[PDB]
Amino acid sequence: MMYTNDNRIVMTLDAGGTNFVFSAIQGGKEIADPVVLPACADCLDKCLGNLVEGFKAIQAGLPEAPVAISFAFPGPADYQAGIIGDLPNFPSFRGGVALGPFLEDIFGIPVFINNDGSLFAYGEALTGVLPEINRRLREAGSTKRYKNLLGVTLGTGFGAGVVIDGELLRGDNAAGGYVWCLRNKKYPEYIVEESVSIRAVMRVYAERSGDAGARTPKEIFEIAEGIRPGNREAAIAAFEELGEMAGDALASAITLIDGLIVIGGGLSGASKYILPVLLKEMNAQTGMMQKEVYDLDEEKSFAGFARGEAVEVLVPGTNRKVGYDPCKRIGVTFSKQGANRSIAMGAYVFALNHL
Amino acid sequence: MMYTNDNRIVMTLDAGGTNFVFSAIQGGKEIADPVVLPACADCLDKCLGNLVEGFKAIQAGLPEAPVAISFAFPGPADYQAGIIGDLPNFPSFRGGVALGPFLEDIFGIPVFINNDGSLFAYGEALTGVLPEINRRLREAGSTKRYKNLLGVTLGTGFGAGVVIDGELLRGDNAAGGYVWCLRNKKYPEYIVEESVSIRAVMRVYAERSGDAGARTPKEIFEIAEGIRPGNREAAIAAFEELGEMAGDALASAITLIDGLIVIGGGLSGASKYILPVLLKEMNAQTGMMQKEVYDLDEEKSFAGFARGEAVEVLVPGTNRKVGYDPCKRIGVTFSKQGANRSIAMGAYVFALNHL
C-alpha cells in the first residue's frame, strides 16, 4: 500500500507496440481516461507530434497540474540522457532522438525514460515482493533483511532489471542487468533467451510431440495441466526445459548480485512447472561450491529461509552479544502484483524519488 | 596521487597466511615499522590477544593518534558486522568471532574488515586505473565516463570485487561480486577457478608437455617466453587456456555489471599471453547479440575506445544540441599499481570514506 494517499500526479505512456497509450497516475491509481493515438513511426515529426498531443490531451483533464512524466521505452537508448537509439520497429528513429529533453521542453516538468526490465525490478523492490519478504522475515523473528533484487520477466523475451538497495543498476552503457544474452547451457552456440521465451515453450512442445500446429503457451499449459488434449509429457518438458536454462542463467547472474530473485511476465502462469526444475538447477550449481535457494512461495520452505542458522555471539571480554548468521541463502518468488502493475508503479515511484 | 597529503592515520593488518603483520598508513605511505606476531590459531584467546598486542605495539609509535583500522580478512564472514565465520586455517574460529566489535572496544576507534577481492576493486576504482581511464577519456575529448568496475585477482584463486559508482557491491550474504564459482566452460561439472588459478597454469603445462616436475608459473612463463627450456607450445597453452575460461566468466559477469574490468594478481606477469585469448572470448560471446571489449592497455585500441561513435543531436524544435553515443563498449586493463598496493589503499580509503 505504498504511496496510496499521495496527491502528486505523473503522466505515463505505454509504447508496448503498434501505438501509444497515454495515461496518468495519482497515488497508486490510474486517474486518467486513457488516450490512444497511433505512433506514426515512418514520420519522426508525425509521431513526435502525437506524443505532444497525447500528453496534452491528458494534462487538460487533470485536477491539479502534473509533477512529471515517466514511462518505459523500447530502446536501445541512453535512458538517463533520455535520448533513444535506432529502434527496429521505428524507422523515423535512426540517428538518435532526444525524446526526453524534447518533452521536458514542451512541458517544463522532468521526464524519465527507462526500459521494461528496469521498471519491473524497481517496482518489485519498493512496491512488490521485496518489502513483503523483509517484513515476513522480521515478523518471523529474523534479523536478516534483503536489499538486492534481480527481477526478470519471462515472456516475449527474457528481460531483467537489477536493484541494489534502492539504486537501479543502470550500467555504464545503459545496459546493466542484462541476462538475455548470457550463454545458453544446452545450446552453447546460442543465447539463453532462445530457450527462455514464448518461442522456446512453443518450439519444444512442437519437437517433443509431433504437432506442427500453432499453439499458444496457455494452450500448452492447459495440455500439461490435463484440461486440453495433446502430448502431456511434451507439454511439461516445454516448461521444465525452460526452467532448466532460466535457472542456469539466474544462478550465474545472482552469484554476482547476491540478492533475492523475482520472476514475472506472461509465462508466470506456469509457475507450477517452471519453478521446481529452475530451483533444482540453481541448487545444483551453487552446490559445486555454501548457498541455498529457497522457494519463497511455499510456507515450509520460507520458514527455513527465515531462520537459517541464526545465533548470538558474545563480544570477547565484554558482556555484550551481537547477532550472526553464517547461513548464506537466497530465494526466488513470483510477482504477486503482476509485471504490468509493477512496471507502472516502477515508473511512478522512480519519478517521485528523482524529482 | 589521491590522499597524498592527508594527516589521518589508519592502522592495518596483513593476515595473508601463517602469521599477522601489523602496519599503519598515513597519506598514501606506510609510516609504521611493521610488527610481526604469530597467529595462534589453535587458541582463540592467544591470537585474539596477539591482535591486541600487534595493534597496541604500532599505536604506541605514531605521531598523532590513529583515526581507525581496516584490513582484509580470510572469511567467509559477515564483513559489515565485522564478525568472522568458520575459517579452515583457523581452528579456534568455529562458531562466529566478533572480531570487528572486539577491537572496536579495545581501541574505541572504528574497525573495518573486508575480503581481498573487495578492497582490490575499491582500490582500483578510487586510486588505480578507473580514474586514469576516465581522465584519459576526457583528455581524448570523449564525453563518456565509466563508474562501474569489476576487479579480479588472478592468483592462488580467482578472486574478485565489484564497485558501482563508489559503492562496494557487498551483497545480502556478504558474497557480492563472486566470480570464482561460476560454471566452467570446458569443464561443465566444475567451477571456473579450477581453470583460472596457479593450479590451472601448472596443471595444463604438465598435461600438454610430458613434464611431471613441479614448475612455478614464473618458470612456465619463462618457458613460453623462450628463456627457460621446455615445451614452449605447452607453456603458452597453459596461459591461453586460462585466458579462455577467465574471458568466458568475465563476459557473463560483466553482462550484469556493464562496466570496466581490472585484472591483477600474481599471474598478471603473463599479460602477454593471457589478454589476447581472454579478449577474443569476450568478443565472441557478446557478439552473439552490440558490445565490444577493447584492450585499454594498447594505444591504438584505447583510441577507438575513447571516441566510439560520438555525435551531437538537436533537441527537436529547439536550437539546442545534446550529446549522444550509441556505441556501447567495455574494456579490460591490468592493474598498474599492483594488487598489493590497491588492496592496502582500498583499506585505507574505505576507512576514510566510512568514518
XYZ file of C-alpha atoms in Angstrom:
710
model
C 0.000 0.000 0.000
C 2.912 2.356 -0.752
C 2.051 5.953 -1.854
C -1.693 5.121 -1.647
C -2.599 8.637 -0.400
C -0.157 10.758 -2.448
C -1.602 13.744 -4.381
C 1.336 14.046 -6.855
C 0.415 13.110 -10.471
C 2.783 11.510 -13.013
C 1.701 11.151 -16.643
C 2.717 7.896 -18.247
C 2.805 6.169 -21.609
C 2.590 2.615 -22.901
C 4.568 2.258 -26.126
C 4.293 -1.531 -25.849
C 3.694 -1.950 -29.572
C 1.773 -0.686 -32.640
C 0.597 2.521 -30.912
C 0.834 4.929 -27.936
C -1.486 4.741 -24.902
C -1.236 7.792 -22.646
C -2.374 7.783 -19.014
C -1.708 9.360 -15.575
C -1.061 8.010 -12.064
C -2.027 9.592 -8.712
C -1.359 7.688 -5.525
C -1.319 4.105 -6.757
C -4.365 4.618 -9.001
C -4.801 5.298 -12.721
C -6.821 8.533 -12.676
C -6.918 9.398 -16.376
C -9.313 8.205 -19.013
C -6.687 6.644 -21.319
C -5.961 8.295 -24.708
C -4.987 6.150 -27.700
C -3.131 7.720 -30.620
C -1.113 5.968 -33.304
C 2.681 6.016 -33.414
C 3.442 7.287 -36.910
C 6.871 5.645 -36.866
C 7.537 6.437 -40.535
C 7.429 10.206 -39.911
C 9.560 11.434 -36.989
C 7.626 14.737 -36.826
C 4.257 12.973 -37.058
C 4.594 10.596 -34.037
C 6.767 13.015 -32.122
C 3.765 15.345 -32.648
C 1.314 12.700 -31.434
C 3.289 12.333 -28.198
C 2.804 16.032 -27.573
C -0.913 15.715 -28.403
C -1.251 12.556 -26.311
C 0.195 14.122 -23.189
C -1.526 17.481 -23.778
C -4.809 15.597 -24.064
C -4.371 14.058 -20.615
C -2.895 17.106 -18.881
C -6.024 19.134 -19.835
C -8.309 16.776 -17.827
C -6.407 16.589 -14.515
C -7.425 18.067 -11.131
C -4.033 19.534 -10.120
C -1.143 20.018 -12.576
C 1.260 17.072 -13.140
C 4.643 16.850 -11.368
C 6.495 14.804 -14.039
C 6.133 12.070 -16.634
C 7.905 8.757 -16.850
C 7.432 5.729 -18.998
C 9.174 2.712 -20.417
C 10.529 2.801 -23.932
C 11.790 0.119 -26.373
C 15.481 1.101 -26.702
C 18.427 0.613 -27.028
C 18.778 4.122 -25.704
C 20.780 6.368 -23.426
C 17.939 6.232 -20.917
C 19.468 8.541 -18.334
C 20.038 11.218 -21.002
C 16.566 10.416 -22.354
C 17.689 10.052 -25.964
C 16.588 6.938 -27.859
C 18.608 4.877 -30.332
C 17.927 3.135 -33.634
C 14.808 1.088 -32.901
C 13.927 -1.642 -35.419
C 10.135 -1.098 -35.232
C 10.522 2.752 -35.543
C 12.166 3.731 -38.833
C 11.967 7.521 -38.204
C 14.297 6.996 -35.194
C 17.622 6.206 -36.883
C 20.271 8.748 -35.714
C 19.388 9.403 -32.054
C 16.183 11.106 -30.923
C 16.395 13.333 -27.845
C 12.908 12.341 -26.757
C 13.435 13.047 -23.058
C 14.626 16.667 -23.428
C 12.049 17.293 -26.166
C 9.082 16.586 -23.885
C 10.923 18.246 -20.972
C 10.894 21.454 -23.067
C 7.271 21.259 -24.291
C 6.050 20.553 -20.738
C 8.652 22.053 -18.353
C 8.364 19.241 -15.807
C 11.035 16.485 -15.834
C 10.669 13.280 -17.878
C 12.140 9.849 -17.125
C 12.530 7.066 -19.657
C 13.592 3.529 -18.774
C 13.305 0.004 -20.212
C 10.672 -2.527 -19.110
C 13.071 -4.798 -17.202
C 14.373 -1.930 -15.056
C 10.988 -0.520 -14.053
C 9.822 -4.042 -13.208
C 12.647 -4.726 -10.777
C 12.283 -1.237 -9.286
C 8.552 -1.730 -8.902
C 9.027 -5.047 -7.082
C 11.821 -3.618 -4.903
C 9.768 -0.779 -3.457
C 6.145 -1.823 -4.125
C 6.005 -5.575 -4.704
C 7.636 -8.605 -3.144
C 10.850 -7.247 -1.594
C 9.000 -5.321 1.139
C 6.614 -8.264 1.765
C 9.604 -10.630 2.131
C 11.508 -8.370 4.515
C 8.586 -7.820 6.883
C 7.742 -11.510 6.730
C 11.294 -12.078 7.930
C 11.047 -9.575 10.817
C 7.601 -10.980 11.607
C 9.238 -14.452 11.671
C 11.782 -13.025 14.138
C 14.770 -12.995 11.742
C 17.391 -10.290 11.857
C 18.187 -10.710 8.141
C 16.926 -8.146 5.597
C 17.465 -8.302 1.798
C 18.320 -5.113 -0.118
C 19.431 -6.510 -3.521
C 16.828 -7.657 -6.105
C 17.090 -9.255 -9.544
C 13.744 -9.073 -11.337
C 13.201 -10.991 -14.558
C 10.233 -11.072 -16.909
C 9.545 -14.378 -18.627
C 7.626 -13.551 -21.801
C 8.187 -12.370 -25.366
C 11.782 -12.219 -24.194
C 13.898 -12.823 -21.123
C 14.042 -9.296 -19.773
C 15.525 -8.322 -16.438
C 16.459 -5.472 -14.094
C 18.701 -5.155 -11.041
C 18.178 -3.009 -7.943
C 20.908 -2.545 -5.307
C 19.463 -1.209 -2.056
C 17.156 1.203 -3.933
C 19.652 2.135 -6.665
C 18.694 0.867 -10.090
C 21.779 -0.741 -11.645
C 21.908 1.297 -14.879
C 25.320 0.281 -16.163
C 27.839 2.422 -17.990
C 26.229 1.693 -21.357
C 22.635 1.815 -20.112
C 22.846 -1.971 -20.335
C 23.037 -3.012 -16.715
C 21.295 -6.167 -15.533
C 21.011 -7.886 -18.931
C 20.506 -11.673 -18.634
C 19.017 -12.435 -22.054
C 22.351 -12.673 -23.825
C 24.118 -14.986 -21.372
C 25.447 -18.249 -22.821
C 22.816 -21.000 -23.254
C 23.560 -24.151 -21.225
C 22.169 -26.806 -23.643
C 22.970 -24.773 -26.788
C 26.472 -23.232 -26.207
C 26.448 -21.513 -29.631
C 23.221 -19.551 -28.768
C 21.950 -17.167 -26.037
C 19.649 -18.157 -23.154
C 16.645 -16.178 -24.466
C 16.456 -18.758 -27.234
C 15.437 -21.350 -24.631
C 13.701 -18.902 -22.233
C 10.790 -17.222 -24.009
C 7.389 -17.862 -25.581
C 9.311 -19.265 -28.581
C 11.062 -21.918 -26.507
C 7.835 -23.123 -24.960
C 6.105 -23.347 -28.336
C 9.217 -24.745 -30.057
C 9.948 -27.522 -27.579
C 6.362 -28.792 -27.427
C 6.391 -28.937 -31.224
C 9.593 -31.022 -31.070
C 8.668 -33.309 -28.183
C 5.255 -34.025 -29.700
C 4.666 -34.374 -33.435
C 2.258 -31.446 -33.553
C 3.283 -28.810 -36.089
C 0.229 -26.650 -35.360
C 0.429 -23.182 -33.806
C -0.224 -23.467 -30.071
C -0.141 -20.625 -27.513
C 1.703 -21.157 -24.205
C -1.652 -21.001 -22.352
C -2.912 -23.847 -24.600
C 0.338 -25.690 -23.914
C -0.102 -25.101 -20.184
C -3.635 -26.493 -20.472
C -2.255 -29.601 -22.235
C 0.286 -30.138 -19.447
C -2.364 -29.414 -16.843
C -4.668 -32.140 -18.327
C -7.545 -29.881 -19.500
C -6.623 -29.552 -23.174
C -5.843 -32.720 -25.159
C -2.341 -33.307 -26.567
C 1.050 -34.712 -25.511
C 1.066 -34.068 -21.752
C 4.622 -35.405 -21.268
C 5.769 -32.992 -24.018
C 3.730 -30.037 -22.725
C 5.563 -30.423 -19.374
C 9.052 -30.727 -20.875
C 8.286 -27.467 -22.690
C 8.190 -25.677 -19.314
C 10.713 -27.814 -17.425
C 13.245 -27.295 -20.244
C 12.762 -23.532 -19.847
C 13.168 -23.756 -16.098
C 16.481 -25.532 -16.535
C 18.038 -22.770 -18.673
C 16.446 -19.896 -16.774
C 17.869 -21.451 -13.611
C 21.379 -21.768 -15.047
C 21.282 -18.123 -16.128
C 19.747 -16.892 -12.858
C 22.350 -18.934 -10.944
C 25.380 -17.294 -12.561
C 23.707 -13.862 -12.590
C 22.749 -13.945 -8.931
C 26.279 -15.086 -7.983
C 27.447 -11.520 -8.716
C 24.392 -9.716 -7.277
C 23.797 -11.937 -4.233
C 20.155 -10.915 -3.625
C 16.586 -12.169 -3.998
C 15.078 -13.067 -7.397
C 11.629 -12.041 -8.605
C 10.056 -13.619 -11.648
C 7.066 -12.318 -13.544
C 5.674 -11.947 -17.045
C 3.309 -13.899 -19.276
C 4.717 -17.370 -18.699
C 4.455 -16.883 -14.918
C 1.065 -18.604 -15.268
C 3.036 -21.848 -15.399
C 4.802 -21.397 -12.016
C 3.711 -24.952 -11.255
C 6.029 -26.464 -13.910
C 8.841 -23.921 -14.169
C 9.844 -23.205 -10.534
C 10.705 -26.757 -9.431
C 13.233 -27.520 -12.205
C 14.503 -23.925 -12.077
C 15.277 -24.207 -8.347
C 16.745 -27.694 -8.818
C 19.301 -26.154 -11.246
C 20.191 -23.208 -9.083
C 20.960 -25.541 -6.156
C 22.998 -27.919 -8.290
C 25.226 -25.019 -9.495
C 25.804 -23.139 -6.204
C 26.277 -26.682 -4.758
C 29.619 -27.220 -6.526
C 30.999 -24.636 -4.016
C 27.617 -22.684 0.804
C 24.450 -21.210 -0.717
C 20.868 -22.414 -0.891
C 17.981 -21.096 -2.977
C 14.566 -21.409 -1.308
C 11.066 -21.396 -2.744
C 9.814 -18.253 -1.066
C 6.218 -19.078 -2.213
C 5.774 -22.273 -0.115
C 5.343 -21.820 3.681
C 7.525 -24.745 4.815
C 10.354 -23.532 2.540
C 10.061 -19.881 3.634
C 10.263 -20.962 7.272
C 13.775 -22.412 6.828
C 14.643 -19.371 4.730
C 13.733 -17.021 7.580
C 15.635 -18.667 10.417
C 18.596 -20.247 8.671
C 21.238 -20.774 11.361
C 20.799 -17.561 13.416
C 22.578 -17.144 16.779
C 24.059 -14.543 19.144
C 27.802 -14.284 19.772
C 29.434 -12.707 22.776
C 31.881 -9.873 22.105
C 35.107 -11.315 23.627
C 35.811 -9.713 27.028
C 32.549 -7.771 27.025
C 29.159 -8.774 28.449
C 27.506 -7.727 25.140
C 26.019 -10.065 22.487
C 25.970 -9.485 18.694
C 23.759 -11.127 16.029
C 25.262 -13.545 13.496
C 24.027 -15.994 10.908
C 26.658 -17.958 8.955
C 23.911 -19.365 6.736
C 24.126 -17.743 3.325
C 20.838 -18.143 1.459
C 18.886 -16.774 -1.462
C 15.331 -17.099 -2.725
C 13.048 -16.990 -5.723
C 9.494 -15.700 -5.788
C 6.956 -14.908 -8.473
C 5.414 -11.451 -8.611
C 2.111 -11.231 -6.775
C 1.370 -7.826 -8.261
C 1.883 -8.741 -11.950
C 4.565 -7.377 -14.270
C 2.159 -4.732 -15.669
C 1.347 -3.216 -12.276
C 4.968 -3.280 -11.045
C 6.188 -1.644 -14.228
C 3.644 1.187 -13.963
C 4.413 1.638 -10.244
C 8.105 1.494 -11.027
C 7.672 4.408 -13.407
C 5.560 6.247 -10.857
C 7.844 5.774 -7.853
C 11.061 6.286 -9.875
C 9.655 9.614 -10.908
C 8.831 10.681 -7.361
C 12.237 9.645 -5.960
C 14.282 11.503 -8.604
C 12.416 14.866 -8.856
C 48.192 10.773 -6.227
C 44.965 10.565 -4.192
C 45.176 11.414 -0.433
C 48.954 12.013 -0.779
C 48.927 14.872 1.783
C 46.371 13.534 4.299
C 47.382 13.511 8.003
C 44.785 10.878 9.084
C 46.335 7.516 10.132
C 44.703 4.089 9.670
C 46.287 1.009 11.244
C 46.198 -2.065 9.066
C 46.906 -5.776 9.178
C 48.033 -8.454 6.746
C 46.601 -11.831 7.740
C 47.637 -13.240 4.357
C 48.779 -16.530 5.863
C 50.760 -18.212 8.680
C 51.000 -15.018 10.778
C 49.881 -11.403 11.401
C 51.784 -8.364 10.071
C 50.609 -5.086 11.597
C 51.252 -1.700 9.983
C 49.836 1.851 9.610
C 49.050 4.150 6.665
C 49.225 7.974 6.545
C 48.577 9.737 3.273
C 49.455 7.045 0.755
C 52.582 5.978 2.667
C 53.332 3.152 5.105
C 54.597 5.078 8.145
C 54.977 2.281 10.689
C 57.886 -0.036 11.229
C 55.965 -3.296 10.654
C 55.341 -5.644 13.626
C 55.233 -9.412 13.085
C 53.471 -11.630 15.618
C 52.228 -15.175 15.136
C 48.556 -16.055 14.749
C 47.992 -18.674 17.440
C 45.013 -20.104 15.559
C 44.665 -23.070 17.930
C 43.890 -20.807 20.911
C 41.193 -18.172 20.297
C 42.345 -16.131 23.327
C 46.014 -16.412 22.337
C 45.809 -14.936 18.778
C 42.947 -12.646 19.677
C 45.428 -11.415 22.331
C 48.211 -11.034 19.764
C 45.964 -8.813 17.635
C 45.569 -6.502 20.603
C 49.344 -6.574 21.200
C 50.077 -6.113 17.495
C 47.947 -3.008 17.165
C 48.976 -1.638 20.581
C 52.593 -2.039 19.501
C 52.058 0.165 16.449
C 49.761 2.729 18.069
C 52.483 3.480 20.684
C 54.943 4.643 17.962
C 52.720 7.027 15.962
C 52.963 10.843 15.742
C 49.236 11.661 16.097
C 46.645 9.137 17.333
C 45.014 6.809 14.746
C 41.558 7.528 13.271
C 40.537 3.896 12.549
C 41.798 0.491 11.474
C 40.810 -1.566 8.482
C 42.184 -4.694 6.951
C 41.317 -7.654 4.798
C 40.431 -10.949 6.397
C 40.089 -14.541 5.088
C 36.345 -15.168 5.629
C 33.636 -16.296 4.990
C 32.383 -13.641 7.350
C 29.677 -11.078 7.946
C 32.140 -8.361 6.979
C 29.841 -5.405 7.542
C 29.059 -6.633 11.077
C 32.765 -7.429 11.473
C 32.212 -10.962 12.755
C 34.181 -13.775 11.107
C 32.974 -17.276 10.256
C 34.423 -20.781 10.423
C 37.786 -20.406 8.691
C 39.539 -23.632 7.649
C 43.075 -22.420 8.512
C 41.922 -21.036 11.951
C 40.538 -23.796 14.176
C 39.846 -21.501 17.184
C 37.319 -19.622 14.983
C 34.479 -22.148 14.690
C 31.224 -20.552 15.995
C 31.476 -16.896 14.911
C 34.077 -14.467 16.250
C 33.008 -10.839 16.670
C 36.459 -9.602 15.727
C 35.330 -6.188 14.491
C 33.454 -5.131 17.656
C 36.165 -6.675 19.846
C 38.901 -4.386 18.509
C 36.395 -1.504 18.312
C 36.008 -1.867 22.106
C 39.715 -2.248 22.987
C 40.598 0.774 20.817
C 37.456 2.966 20.639
C 38.009 3.967 17.011
C 36.008 2.134 14.295
C 37.303 -1.005 12.548
C 36.511 -2.212 9.024
C 37.045 -5.744 7.781
C 36.654 -6.798 4.155
C 37.863 -9.574 1.828
C 40.812 -9.200 -0.564
C 38.727 -9.079 -3.757
C 36.585 -6.202 -2.469
C 39.438 -3.978 -1.301
C 41.208 -4.585 -4.614
C 38.308 -3.386 -6.736
C 37.731 -0.443 -4.383
C 41.402 0.460 -4.523
C 41.415 0.441 -8.336
C 38.128 2.382 -8.501
C 39.331 5.351 -6.476
C 43.148 5.071 -6.600
C 44.153 2.906 -9.557
C 43.018 2.547 -13.142
C 39.420 3.821 -13.119
C 40.456 7.452 -12.532
C 43.313 7.174 -15.082
C 40.873 5.790 -17.689
C 38.245 8.471 -17.120
C 40.660 11.393 -17.414
C 42.280 9.777 -20.432
C 38.806 9.806 -21.953
C 38.148 13.490 -21.143
C 41.685 14.273 -22.304
C 40.828 12.416 -25.553
C 37.747 14.658 -25.827
C 35.150 11.960 -25.026
C 32.021 12.723 -23.068
C 31.810 9.142 -21.743
C 32.810 8.360 -18.134
C 32.804 4.882 -16.508
C 31.541 4.477 -12.928
C 31.193 0.661 -12.640
C 34.286 -1.544 -12.059
C 34.808 -5.301 -11.821
C 38.239 -6.064 -10.375
C 39.581 -9.606 -10.417
C 42.772 -11.051 -8.977
C 44.358 -13.884 -10.928
C 46.445 -15.856 -8.439
C 46.103 -18.534 -5.768
C 42.439 -18.213 -6.658
C 40.127 -16.272 -8.930
C 39.068 -13.542 -6.541
C 37.001 -10.526 -7.491
C 35.194 -7.407 -6.268
C 32.566 -5.093 -7.749
C 32.225 -1.328 -7.315
C 29.147 0.586 -8.529
C 29.851 4.314 -8.755
C 31.812 4.263 -5.466
C 29.542 1.785 -3.658
C 31.174 -1.552 -2.985
C 28.724 -4.280 -4.022
C 28.576 -6.193 -0.712
C 25.649 -8.489 -1.408
C 22.986 -9.643 1.009
C 25.127 -12.549 2.204
C 28.426 -10.652 2.166
C 29.053 -12.596 -1.036
C 28.630 -9.967 -3.708
C 30.838 -9.995 -6.791
C 31.909 -13.656 -6.608
C 33.165 -14.998 -9.970
C 35.203 -17.991 -8.794
C 32.248 -20.341 -8.570
C 30.716 -19.632 -11.982
C 30.304 -22.642 -14.282
C 33.493 -23.699 -16.124
C 33.183 -23.518 -19.928
C 35.401 -26.516 -20.888
C 34.593 -28.496 -17.713
C 30.799 -28.041 -17.100
C 30.891 -30.230 -13.957
C 33.492 -27.912 -12.262
C 33.871 -24.200 -11.350
C 35.945 -21.658 -13.306
C 38.602 -21.266 -10.576
C 39.684 -24.789 -11.456
C 40.892 -23.484 -14.828
C 41.750 -19.932 -13.640
C 44.439 -20.097 -10.959
C 48.069 -21.026 -10.325
C 46.885 -24.668 -10.340
C 45.489 -24.438 -13.861
C 48.676 -22.955 -15.242
C 50.828 -25.615 -13.590
C 48.327 -28.399 -14.368
C 47.894 -27.657 -18.062
C 51.619 -27.336 -18.781
C 52.104 -30.700 -17.082
C 49.424 -32.186 -19.369
C 50.439 -30.518 -22.626
C 54.091 -31.431 -22.083
C 55.209 -34.702 -20.511
C 56.936 -32.973 -17.611
C 55.705 -34.201 -14.232
C 58.113 -31.947 -12.324
C 56.986 -29.079 -10.091
C 57.206 -25.830 -12.055
C 56.197 -22.349 -10.834
C 54.104 -20.111 -13.123
C 57.087 -17.723 -13.456
C 59.196 -20.687 -14.680
C 56.352 -21.613 -17.021
C 56.180 -18.020 -18.251
C 59.935 -18.148 -18.872
C 59.482 -21.370 -20.892
C 56.779 -19.735 -23.023
C 58.864 -16.588 -23.314
C 61.863 -18.615 -24.670
C 64.319 -18.002 -21.782
C 63.822 -21.235 -19.843
C 63.991 -24.550 -21.731
C 60.901 -26.779 -22.006
C 57.779 -27.216 -24.164
C 57.150 -23.671 -25.418
C 53.928 -24.608 -27.263
C 52.652 -26.148 -23.991
C 53.837 -23.262 -21.793
C 51.718 -20.920 -23.974
C 48.592 -23.099 -23.958
C 48.872 -23.040 -20.159
C 48.158 -19.286 -20.222
C 45.927 -19.148 -23.305
C 43.721 -21.895 -21.819
C 43.340 -19.752 -18.686
C 42.518 -16.689 -20.737
C 39.741 -18.571 -22.487
C 37.917 -19.511 -19.260
C 38.608 -16.230 -17.481
C 37.159 -14.492 -20.534
C 34.006 -16.624 -20.562
C 33.464 -15.898 -16.869
C 34.275 -12.182 -17.183
C 31.944 -11.996 -20.205
C 28.865 -13.302 -18.389
C 29.761 -11.425 -15.187
C 30.242 -8.086 -16.901
C 26.945 -8.528 -18.794
C 25.149 -7.803 -15.498
C 27.543 -5.094 -14.239
C 28.205 -3.330 -17.556
C 31.439 -1.568 -16.501
C 35.211 -1.700 -16.956
C 37.295 -4.731 -15.906
C 40.572 -4.584 -13.996
C 42.817 -7.600 -13.699
C 45.679 -8.022 -11.278
C 47.392 -10.595 -9.092
C 50.381 -12.908 -9.410
C 49.681 -14.271 -12.875
C 49.351 -10.717 -14.243
C 53.046 -11.077 -15.135
C 51.842 -13.072 -18.135
C 49.605 -10.310 -19.598
C 51.321 -11.021 -22.909
C 49.733 -14.497 -23.234
C 46.500 -14.172 -21.262
C 44.916 -10.910 -22.520
C 44.696 -11.738 -26.240
C 42.760 -15.024 -25.886
C 40.750 -13.562 -22.991
C 39.587 -10.619 -25.131
C 38.965 -12.912 -28.114
C 36.469 -14.865 -25.933
C 34.707 -11.850 -24.534
C 34.086 -10.528 -28.065
C 32.886 -13.882 -29.357
C 30.265 -14.093 -26.545
C 28.889 -10.515 -26.574
C 28.999 -10.958 -30.402
C 26.099 -13.444 -30.440
C 23.895 -10.395 -29.585
C 26.146 -4.618 -29.786
C 29.095 -4.600 -27.373
C 32.843 -4.533 -27.879
C 35.625 -5.135 -25.365
C 38.789 -3.104 -26.008
C 42.360 -3.601 -24.860
C 42.693 -0.462 -22.785
C 46.498 -1.066 -22.490
C 47.340 -0.593 -26.215
C 47.179 2.994 -27.597
C 45.542 2.196 -30.956
C 42.832 0.169 -29.168
C 42.203 2.826 -26.493
C 41.775 5.450 -29.208
C 38.736 3.665 -30.696
C 37.516 3.033 -27.159
C 37.537 6.757 -26.380
C 35.683 8.071 -29.415
C 33.371 5.216 -30.319
C 30.582 6.749 -32.408
C 30.064 10.074 -30.556
C 27.826 12.800 -32.041
C 25.538 15.708 -31.114
C 21.777 15.575 -31.667
C 19.480 18.543 -31.954
C 16.593 18.720 -29.484
C 13.580 18.705 -31.877
C 12.127 22.226 -32.216
C 14.875 23.791 -30.117
C 18.192 25.294 -31.242
C 19.990 23.248 -28.530
C 22.264 20.209 -29.091
C 22.671 17.193 -26.754
C 25.499 14.611 -26.613
C 24.878 11.006 -27.679
C 26.922 7.920 -28.399
C 25.038 4.783 -29.494
C 28.280 2.808 -29.296
C 28.160 0.536 -26.274
C 31.667 -0.564 -25.304
C 33.638 -2.065 -22.462
C 37.313 -2.552 -21.684
C 39.882 -4.617 -19.855
C 43.060 -3.338 -18.255
C 45.691 -4.770 -15.952
C 46.469 -3.004 -12.693
C 49.390 -0.612 -12.968
C 49.574 -0.209 -9.206
C 49.739 -3.928 -8.287
C 47.145 -5.894 -6.326
C 49.092 -5.404 -3.054
C 49.126 -1.607 -3.271
C 45.475 -1.337 -4.379
C 44.349 -3.617 -1.582
C 46.181 -1.572 1.068
C 44.868 1.693 -0.431
C 41.420 0.166 -0.647
C 41.523 -0.492 3.081
C 42.855 2.996 3.715
C 40.362 4.902 1.568
C 37.393 2.697 2.578
C 38.180 3.600 6.140
C 38.301 7.331 5.459
C 35.043 7.356 3.454
C 33.002 5.467 6.080
C 34.129 7.161 9.354
